[PDB]
Each structure stands twice: as structure tokens, then as C-alpha cells.
């Protein structure tokens, strides 16, 4: 149930990125402007899909949102400070698709798709999408 949440920026829009740490599986979303509400909405969606026990963030923003607090509590997500390359390689894949899409969000989702379905170096072993299912099945 361990995730990292961070955010990243492109064409002046904010991309929320959750990583399932043991798998490298990602979910992402383009949000209107870093709000408590939208982070809360993304958390509640993610927790309804996967076991989400602990979310690790690297700064204080998410500790100051009333709605994130209520989402955390509603869904039983521990907020934990501290995070003991992803953003970067998702952007490479976004640039290779960017023109195949009117909306930035469609390119973000095409990039999430490829990241989660790819095999590491293109052959053999498991996708991030397969590893997350394999870890939760065990």
C-alpha cells in the first residue's frame, strides 16, 4: 500500500503523479492549480482502485489542505512526510506523443499508458502494471 505523491509542470499546467513504490506503476492527472480539493479528489480515486495505506510527500503543501486531511481520514490513508527520474522519463515519453494529441492531458495519459505497459529495456520480465497486480495478488 505504499505510494509517493509529487507534482510536476508542463505548458503551465500541473500534473499530479502517484507512484506505487515497489512496482513503479504511475497514475497521473492534469489539475487546475495545485488545490487541496483536486489532490483530495485524486487521492480518493486512487484509494478506491488500489490498496492505498501510506502516501509519502517531500514538502508541506499537502499537510495544509483541510480537504486532503478529510480524504486521508475518510479512505484510511496515512499521510507521511519524507521520501526515502520518474518525472523526467514521463516527460521524454510526453514529447514523443505530444503532437498525436490536442490536449496536454491526453499526452500525459498516453505517457502513463506506455510507462505502465512497457517492459524495462523493451523485452522480458514484467511491466509496472503487471508488477503492481502481482504484488497485490501476493
Ligand X SMILES: C#Cc1oc2ccc(C)cc2c1CC(=O)O
Rounded distance between C-alpha atoms, residue 8 and residue 13, angstroms:
8
Residues 35 and 43: beta-carbon distance below 8 Å:
no
Contact string 2-41 vs a copy of itself (x = CB under 8 A): -------------------------x-------------x
Contact string 51-80 vs a copy of itself (x = CB under 8 A): -----------------------xx-----
Residues 30 and 108: beta-carbon distance below 8 Å:
yes
In sign, the C-alpha dihedral spanning 130, 131, 133, 134 is positive
- From the list a copy of itself, ligand X, none, partner contacted by residue 133 (C-beta under 5 to 8 A by kind): a copy of itself
Residues 131 and 22: beta-carbon distance below 8 Å:
yes
- In terms of CB distance, is 103 or 119 closer to ligand X? 103
- In terms of CB distance, is 70 or 136 closer to ligand X? 70
Using the rule CB under 8 A, give the single segment among 10-18, 56-64, 78-86, 113-121 that binds a copy of itself: 113-121
Does the protein bind a copy of itself through residue 93 (CB under 8 A)?
no
CA 128 to chain centre: 12
Amino acid at each position: 500500500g505504499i505510494w509517493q505523491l509529487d507534482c510536476t509542470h508542463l505548458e503551465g499546467k500541473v500534473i499530479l503523479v502517484a507512484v506505487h513504490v515497489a512496482s513503479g506503476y504511475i497514475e497521473a492527472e492534469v489539475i487546475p492549480a495545485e488545490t487541496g480539493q483536486e489532490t483530495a479528489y485524486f487521492l480518493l480515486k486512487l484509494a478506491g482502485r488500489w490498496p492505498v495505506k501510506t502516501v509519502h510527500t517531500d514538502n508541506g503543501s499537502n499537510f495544509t489542505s483541510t480537504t486532503v486531511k478529510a480524504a486521508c481520514e475518510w479512505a484510511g490513508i496515512k499521510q507521511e512526510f519524507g521520501i526515502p527520474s520518474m518525472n523526467k522519463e514521463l516527460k521524454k515519453i510526453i514529447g514523443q506523443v505530444r503532437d498525436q494529441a490536442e490536449h496536454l492531458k491526453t499526452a500525459v495519459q498516453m505517457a502513463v499508458f506506455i510507462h505502465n505497459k512497457k517492459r524495462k529495456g523493451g523485452i522480458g520480465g514484467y511491466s509496472a502494471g503487471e508488477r503492481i497486480v502481482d504484488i497485490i495478488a501476493t
